């Protein structure tokens, strides 16, 4: 009994953490694209603030 569940324990463990590695890198590209759209507004706000 204890070695039958030892089969099934590693097949629910592995598919959870192999999609966490999908989504831990998925957030790494959104927060570097959201900060790409935001920064290009910041360095054109400096010229909208300087000449006044």
């Amino acid at each position: 009994i204890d070695l039958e569940k030892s089969q099934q324990a590693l097949v629910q463990k592995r598919h959870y953490l192999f999609d966490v590695q999908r989504n831990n890198i998925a957030m790494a590209l959104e927060v570097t694209y959201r900060e790409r759209l935001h920064r290009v507004y910041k360095e054109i706000k400096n010229r909208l603030d300087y000449h006044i």
Partner: protein, 70 residues
């Protein structure tokens, strides 16, 4: 007091007629605000008048490791 009032309006229009700019300032107001803005632009930032900024960024290299199980 209206006759005193239009006497003020006369001297504002002779102050409008300018050809050399600051007549009473001289070098005192010219050396001040040129040094005042450059002391403030040093606190503001080194940005050009028409150079639009453009750049790129490098994301982290998503590496992997090994772990022998089953």
């Amino acid at each position: 007091v209206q006759k005193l009032f239009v006497d003020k309006i006369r001297e504002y229009r002779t102050k409008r007629q300018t050809s050399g700019g600051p007549v009473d300032a001289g070098p005192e107001y010219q050396q001040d605000l040129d040094r005042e803005l450059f002391k403030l632009k040093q606190m503001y930032g080194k940005a050009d008048m028409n150079t639009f900024p453009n750049f790129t960024f490098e994301d982290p290299k998503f590496e992997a490791v090994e772990k022998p199980q089953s």
